[PDB]
UniProtKB/Swiss-Prot annotation:
Family to which this protein belongs: Belongs to the MAGUK family.
Subunit structure and binding partners: Interacts through its PDZ domains with ANO2 and NETO1. Interacts with KCNJ4. Interacts through its first two PDZ domains with GRIN2A, GRIN2B, GRIN2C and GRIN2D. Interacts with ERBB4. Interacts with KCNA1, KCNA2, KCNA3 and KCNA4. Interacts with LRRC4 and LRRC4B. Interacts with SYNGAP1. Interacts with ASIC3. Interacts with SEMA4C. Interacts with CXADR. Interacts with KCND2. Interacts (via first PDZ domain) with CRIPT. Interacts through its first PDZ domain with GRIK2 and KCNA4. Interacts through its second PDZ domain with the PDZ domain of NOS1 or the C-terminus of CAPON.
Secretion signal, residue range per the UniProt entry: none
Localization, UniProt: Cell membrane; Postsynaptic density; Synapse; Cytoplasm
Role played: Postsynaptic scaffolding protein that plays a critical role in synaptogenesis and synaptic plasticity by providing a platform for the postsynaptic clustering of crucial synaptic proteins. Interacts with the cytoplasmic tail of NMDA receptor subunits and shaker-type potassium channels. Required for synaptic plasticity associated with NMDA receptor signaling. Overexpression or depletion of DLG4 changes the ratio of excitatory to inhibitory synapses in hippocampal neurons. May reduce the amplitude of ASIC3 acid-evoked currents by retaining the channel intracellularly.
The organism of origin for this protein: Rattus norvegicus
Protein name: Disks large homolog 4
Tissue expression pattern: Expressed in brain (at protein level). Detected in juxtaparanodal zones in the central nervous system and at nerve terminal plexuses of basket cells in the cerebellum. Expressed in cerebrum. Expressed in hippocampal neurons (at protein level). Isoform 1 and isoform 2: highly expressed in cerebellum, cortex, hippocampus, and corpus striatum.
Residue list for modification Phosphoserine: 13, 82
Gene: Dlg4
Superkingdom of the organism of origin: Eukaryota
Full protein: residues contained: 61 to 151 of 724
Amino acid sequence: MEYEEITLERGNSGLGFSIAGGTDNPHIGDDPSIFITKIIPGGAAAQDGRLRVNDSILFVNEVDVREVTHSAAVEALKEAGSIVRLYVMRR
């Protein structure tokens, strides 16, 4: 798996992609691995096109989601500020 970064400007509505995974929501095979599930068209994510669904969030702005709850990961994207460089995994 390769770790990539995606700078996304949290539009007036938000970043632009929903993630599934975390220490509270094992979206994966019963693991805290945070990974995206779908990017919403018309948002900073879909408008930019630098991120791809299923991407396993590794970092967010300056946060390590290696041991954070799915809500923390989600909140991360929301706390990233505006144009945040998100780190994700790619297999």
